[PDB]
Structure formats: structure tokens, C-alpha cells
Assembly symmetry: D3
Homo-oligomer: 162 residues x 6
Amino acid sequence: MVQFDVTIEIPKGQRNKYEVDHKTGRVRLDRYLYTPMAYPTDYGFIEDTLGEDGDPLDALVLLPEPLFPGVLVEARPVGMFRMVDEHGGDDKVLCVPVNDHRWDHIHGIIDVPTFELDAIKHFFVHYKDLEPGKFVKAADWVGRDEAEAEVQRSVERFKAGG
Amino acid sequence: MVQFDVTIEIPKGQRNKYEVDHKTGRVRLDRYLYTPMAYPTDYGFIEDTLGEDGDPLDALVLLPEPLFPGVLVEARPVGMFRMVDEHGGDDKVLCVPVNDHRWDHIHGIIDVPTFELDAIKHFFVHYKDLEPGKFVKAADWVGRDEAEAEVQRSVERFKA
Amino acid sequence: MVQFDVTIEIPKGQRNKYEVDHKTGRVRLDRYLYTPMAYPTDYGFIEDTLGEDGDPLDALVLLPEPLFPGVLVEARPVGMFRMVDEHGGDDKVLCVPVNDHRWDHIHGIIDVPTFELDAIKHFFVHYKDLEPGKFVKAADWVGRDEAEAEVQRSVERFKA
Amino acid sequence: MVQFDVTIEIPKGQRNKYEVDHKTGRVRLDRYLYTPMAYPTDYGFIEDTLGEDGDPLDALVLLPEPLFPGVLVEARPVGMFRMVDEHGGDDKVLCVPVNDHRWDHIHGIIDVPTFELDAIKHFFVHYKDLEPGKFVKAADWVGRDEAEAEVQRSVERFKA
Amino acid sequence: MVQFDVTIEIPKGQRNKYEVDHKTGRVRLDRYLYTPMAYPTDYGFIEDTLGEDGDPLDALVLLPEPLFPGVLVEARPVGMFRMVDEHGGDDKVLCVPVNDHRWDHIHGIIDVPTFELDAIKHFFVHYKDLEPGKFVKAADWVGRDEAEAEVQRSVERFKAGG
Amino acid sequence: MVQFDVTIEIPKGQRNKYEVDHKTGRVRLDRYLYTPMAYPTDYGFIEDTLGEDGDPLDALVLLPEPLFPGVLVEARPVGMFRMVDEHGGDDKVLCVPVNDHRWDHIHGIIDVPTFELDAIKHFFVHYKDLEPGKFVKAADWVGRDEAEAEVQRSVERFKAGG
């Protein structure tokens, strides 16, 4: 069973887009969203990963209640949101907390209610609609096998980068 | 100097869509939104008006902090949001609290920052995107003169 | 397809125990809980029912976000919590909002996760532990058929 | 053992100043405070009283957690805050919830910590500092005997 | 007058059980409680202490309003909650902030209202009721002298461990 | 255009007075306010500055929604609140976030609504009214040029201190 640590940057329900500066460890405000939308899940990144674009792999964590920026949660992948925007491809691994029987019945993307996947998709498709020169050309969901393959590639890129 | 009472149905920042039952006065949950969006202003209706569709005229109230459902606020119009959806036309009057010097500089639609008007528009254009059979085909803003003309039509329509 | 209106008294997550005075319609603070616990669901009563004890039938409503005291929500029964305390028997109907596809998979008590039923039970078993003379001697769950039978008895008891 | 019902208008910690319209029962937004201050207690009025100025007698209720506007709480007086502002005299009865052992040690004004009385005073002395034409010239505390005498005058004034 | 620094892990009113990883300094989500209960006080640990079980001594801090995970508060002990669970004995020192006249009248456990002690006891007796293989065999309160003796033992264990 | 990093200590709306210990980086509770007031803006300090009194220069940041203690925001100065209290002079630089068109129209103190400046002044004039031996003798506002001059002096003092 693949599992890993996710650092939360943005609690569910927030309109402030926080980001961890990976050089310093500091939490920074990127910006307050320009749209009347709020993050649909807790949002952050997988520790010890490196995506194709130089930053760690993004993670979305399903949780009963929001966390605080900077908090670590041990999690396991169930699928992956993929999108194409102004900086090209962007993937976000969808995760649930490990060692919690309340999530035991969610083994893969097929187990996650469609209305929840659709809400998360809608957020990422629209949240930058009022930001000039930002766009989304494509967005879809893939399952746990493909999420794990991407996690593995990013773990490999992390190790190769030093 | 047009002014009126607004009953708030939905506080700013809420994802629960409350509505007042106008035949009982009860506050009901209509639905929880299917989209990850939140009401961009306090939202409700103008007391003693009747729109083209039989409900009181909707109102959006700019405020420093959100209210509670059922609360009355005396307000004045600065403009009007108009849209066309699955039910046809819909107007929502944009308002600011009266006799509050902090809003005295806002006389009309040109005085409301574009980024704020664009955010309000974005909410109404997209908030029903995930509801089968619902849609928004057009949405725009008109000024205070047009808003007051609509309020006046709605007030007379109430009287008749 | 049994459905009814629920008036919410107490939002999920609250430690203030509000109650509606059924002779006036006012919302009153009963008490702040003496235990470090919070209501596990939105909590209220079914409009136009009368229980065995003279009050409307209590209802627990599963919702994505809590409501406000006094708010009406149209709901359908999926099961019923039963308990015995210092006043004798008490039933609370477990409900989900109607005409909301997000709840369409929940048809009966077997469809509600055990961990959620256990949490609701734990609240009612313990929330009065620190009140002299109050106690809970037994608590259990029954299914949708039993819940609808109790709603029907309560509706007729209201009519009579 | 004097006790009465208090309707809460403004929850503790709020910067929105709500008021009940006593001729309709509606809750209205009076104003958002112009000062960076927040109500130090739950704030409202005593039902079935009439002050010297024609409004019900104001009440401050000490509670572990704030309520919602319009909520009723059965309370007992422990003292009274008095002030003089632009409208002349104003009294606010300081109260604690009845039949709650957690407040049984609070019998009168001497039982309320000085730091808490000083904070409440500071709020009423300063909350209108940034409103032209408004002022507070004097403010003080009196004990439970004086509070009950004022409640009694207000109750009779209501009856007459 | 004994005083010390408490790092808060869990704000009063929360149902998320956060914990500081003492090796790394990171705040982690342990778990969301399985019971409909919420922490009755701000909850954390005494810096520079070591309990018998290898972790710093736990602290409960009485405060007018909750803090954030990771925040330091200078505090003084007024008593100690003692319990016996599945890992044996567990003590939690009850504290108030120092240099604050609003707490000056609380010198010991006898000064703390009984209903508040009973609520805190009820939380620790019941909060793991729905977690299999977790239990509580005993729970009680002792006073300031005994709290200070335990604080001193833990300070001593801290120093002996390195 | 002068810009700098502000670390937030106290979110707008709070009555807990948090402070960063500049030696350790830890966020500490200083105290809960004794007055029924709440911070009128997000409040903190400018990184890499040193005031005359030995601490970094204080900053007030205008924001649509409050942040969390410890969060960095890149900001630009629009004016400065000056006051004289029990420790003598104290200045707080008023700032807006950079690279955000929603604040583009605020170039200086003259652009900030008077009612907002008056509310911020009232807070600092009164928030210590119930703390014995604390007082305020003077308080006023100066504009962006004078804010930038003070920022520059504090940057210079920072560099001279090591």
C-alpha cells in the first residue's frame, strides 16, 4: 500500500491561497482568489516529491474537518486530477488519511462520489477565471494506478535531483 | 433619494441557499450549492415589492460583515444585476446601507470596483453549473437610474 | 415516499441546547451542555406531529453544513434512534434532505456508516452524564419502516 | 428570587449592532460599529418591561457561549450598569442564567470579577467615540438591590 | 513560583487531534476524534520535560480564548489530572498563564470550579470510547504540590536523557 | 517601488496578542487584551528591519481576509501610524499587498478612507486603557514618503547591527 506525508497549505473552505516556499519552509500568502469560490478540499503537496515543473507533487486530501497551513497528514492515493493550464500540465493527487477505518471503503477513484469529484473539478476549472492570461484547456480524473505511477515518477525525480 | 427595507436571506460567504417562504415568513433551506462557491454579498429581497415573476425583487447588499437570515437592513440602490437563466429574466438590485457615511461615496454603479462587480457576476453565472437543466445565458450590470425604475415598477406591481 | 418538514433547533457542532417553545414559536436557550460534547447532527422536530409525550417528534438531519435555529428543511426518514432516560422513552427520526441526488443512495439505516450511527448514539448516551438525576439506560437504532410507522402514529396523534 | 426572560439582540463578540423593532418583532441591523470594538456580553432586553424612555429595559447576560439574535434566555439580575450619553440616562441590567449551578456562586455585583465589569464599562464608554454628536459623560455600576428596584419600576411602567 | 513554557498542540473546541513530532518540530494530524466531543481546554506539552513514557509532560492550559497549534504560552501549574489507560499511567498538568492578574486568584486545584474539572475529566474518560482496544481504568485530580513534584521529576528526566 | 516581506503575528479580528520571539522564531502568546477591542488589521513586522527600540519595524497590512500567525505577505508601504506610549515612540507602517490590482488605486495615505485610519488610530489609542502604567500621549498618521524614510532607516539599522 503506497502512503506518504502531505503538508497542507490551504484548508478546505478558504479563499486565501497560501503556499509553502520550498527553499525556506515559510508559509506565504500567494493571493486572495479573485473569484467567489473556496478550496473544495484541504490542499497541499507530497513531501519528498518533485514534479516535472520543479515543485513537489500537489495533493488534495479528503477530511472530515479542515486543518491549518503547515500541518502534516499521513495519506494514501485514491486517484488524480489532471489539468492543462497556462503553465502546461498540472496534476493533483487525491488522497485519504491512512490508518482510519472511516476511509477504508475508499480504495480508488471509482469509490469517490461523483458529485464530489465534479465539485473539485469545477473549482480548478474556474477559480482563475478572472485572472488575465490564465486559462484551463483540459481537466479530467484518473484512478489510483495512474496516481501511484505519477507519485513514483516524482519520488524518482526527487531522488535524481539530489 | 430612493430607499427601502431589505430582508436578508443568505449571508455573504455561505454555501447554504436559504429562502424566505413569502406565504408564511419562515426561513427554509432551498439547497446546499453543488458548486464550490459562496455567496459574494449578503443576499435577500426588498420588502413590499413584487417582481415580474410574482416574488419580491431580489437585492444584493454590500456590507462590511455578513448578517443573519431574516434580518432587516435599510438600504439604497446603486445599480442592478440582470441575468437570463432557465426561468427567463432575473434582476437583483445592488444596494448599500443608508445613513452610513462609510458608503456615502458610492452613488452609482461606476463607484463600485470592477473587480467586485465581476466577482458577483461570476457567482451568478456559475453557481448552478452542476445542476442538470439549469443554465445562465446572459448577465450584465445597469446603473442606478435603471435600478430605481425597476424598484418603482415592482412597488406599484405590489400595490396593484 | 414519506416526507415532511423539519424545524431545526440546534445546529450540528453546537454546545448550546436551544429549544422551540411550541406555544409561542420562540427559540429559547434550554441550557449550555455540562459535558465537553457537541450535537452530532442538526437537531430539531417534525412539524405537525405529536409524540407520545405531547411534544412534536424529534428529528436528526444529516446535512453537509449546519443550519440556523428556526430554519425549515424538507426531509425524508431513513431510520430512528430510540432511547430510555429519566423521562422514559424517546425517539428521534434520522432524516436526509429530499430531492437532493447527493443523498439518493441513502435509502435506509443500513446505508448510514456505522461510525456515524455510533457517534450519534454516543452523544445521546453521554451528553447528560454530568446532570444529577439524569441518565440514559438504553439506546438503539431501528430502520426506515419503523421510523415511518412512528411518524404516521405521530401525525394521527397530532390530528386527534 | 427575581427572574425574567431576556431576548438577545446582539451576541457577544459581534461588531454588528442589531436591534429588535418592538412594534413588529423584526430584527434589524442598526449599524456596524465605527470603532474596532466588540460587544463584551450578550446584549438584549427584558421582555414585558418599559424603561423611562419608552423602550424595554436593556439587559447584559453573562454566558459561556454567545447566542443568536432573537433567542430567549431566562435570567436573574446581579447588578446594573448605568450611563449618561447624548440621549440622557441609560440603564442595563447585568444578568446570569437561572437554574444553572455554574452561576449559583454569583449572587450580586461583588461576585463579578472587576476586570470583567471594567471591560463592559470600557465598551459602553468608547464604542460610539467615532460618531459625531454621540458621547458618554458618566458610567458606573450599582448592585442587585438597585437592579431589582429598576426592574420592578419598569414592569409596573409596562403594566400602566 | 514554578513556571514553564507550554507549546499548544490542540486549541479548545477542536475535534482534530494534532501532535507535535518531537524529533522534527512538525505539527501532524494524529486523527479526527471518533466521538462527538471537543477538547475542553487548550492542550499541549511542557517544553524541556520528559515523562516516564518518553514524551514531554502533557499540559492543559485554561485560557479565555483558544490559541493556534504550535504557539508557546508561559504558564504555571495549579493541579494535575491523572489517568490510567491502555498504555498505563498518563498525567496532564493543569496550568494558567503567568503574569496575568485575571488568573491571580487561582493558586491551586481547590480554586478551580468543580464543574470545569468534571468536564475536563469527562472528556478524557470518554473521548476514545469508540476506538477499539482503548480504555480508561482510572482518572482523578491532584493538587498543585503533586503537579510541581511531577514537573520536577520530568525536568530531571529531561536532563538525565541528555 | 519600495516593497518588503511582512510576517503576520496577529490576524485582524483577534483579541489574542501573539508575538514572534525574534531570537527563536517561535510564536508566543503575549496576552489576551484586557479591553473589548479586536485588532483592526492584520498586524506584524517587516522582516530584515530594526527599529530604534531593538525590534523589527511593526507593520499593519490591509487585506480582504485575515491570515494566520507566522504567514509571510509581500507588501508595499502607503503611510505610517506614529504614537508615543510608556516606552516612548512607536511607529507602525501601513501596507497593502503587492502585485494585486485590487489595491493599485491606493498609492498613499491620502487614498485610504478616513474612517479606516480613524478606526485603526482608536484601537492603538485605547487597547491598553485597562493595563496599569500603560498610556498613550500622542498618535497621528504620516504619508508614504515618511513611511519609506523610516523603512530605509530600519533597513540601515538592521545592516549596521550585523
